[PDB]
Design a protein around this ligand. Structure first.
Ligand SMILES: CCNC(=O)c1cc2c(N[C@H](c3ccc4c(c3)S(=O)(=O)CCC4)C(C)C)ncnc2[nH]1
Length: 168
């Protein structure tokens, strides 16, 4: 039903909230939840692990079946699969892991996938252990995504830093 609440409106189409994406998916029941995936869809930790555990491992079983038939994704690519109990669909998006030396230019390619969905609940791509500068990731989102994106950032200090930087 996409009933998002408690978000700050940064631009005409980008919103942000200090929240756990799993709890937001349970509260909002969005049409699309974005997963910060890796190319072989192994959802063991971070955001992907949090989403998979909230589906009681249904997301991992479906992803394994996808990988068996189709092989891995490319960095910057995406895949629509079921959202299980969290959303109607899960858009698995692979942003670059700059801590492992992947190309930061592909973060624009990763956000470009959001433009195929009129409204999405999403994490901040390539942040956390993927090592991208989180302020840069928020700027790429703002400049690339035209559809309505609701970013959940589960860290108060990071959220406050992103907001303060954007409002300069
Ligand atoms: C209690 C269960 N929930 C969680 O653990 C949880 C964690 C979490 C979250 N983490 C951010 C984040 C954003 C992007 C990426 C990562 C981490 S990663 O997994 O380190 C690598 C892939 C890219 C941090 C930057 C704050 N953002 C929103 N909702 C969340 N929920």
């Amino acid at each position: 039903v996409n009933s998002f609440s408690g978000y700050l409106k940064l631009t005409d189409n980008v919103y942000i909230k200090n929240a756990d994406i799993v709890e937001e998916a349970k509260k909002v029941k969005p049409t699309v939840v974005v997963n910060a995936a890796n190319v072989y869809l192994k959802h063991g930790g971070g955001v992907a692990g949090a989403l998979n555990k909230a589906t009681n491992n249904a997301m991992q079983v479906e992803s394994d079946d996808y990988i068996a038939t189709n092989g891995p994704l490319k960095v910057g690519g995406s895949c629509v699969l079921s959202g299980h109990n969290l959303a109607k669909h899960c858009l698995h998006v692979v942003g670059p892991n700059v801590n492992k030396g992947e190309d930061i230019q592909l973060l624009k390619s990763a956000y470009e996938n959001f433009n195929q969905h009129e409204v999405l609940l999403a994490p901040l791509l390539s942040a956390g252990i993927f090592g991208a500068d989180p302020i840069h990731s928020l700027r790429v989102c703002v400049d690339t995504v035209r559809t309505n994106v609701y970013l959940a950032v589960f860290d108060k200090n990071l959220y406050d830093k992103l907001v303060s930087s954007f409002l300069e």
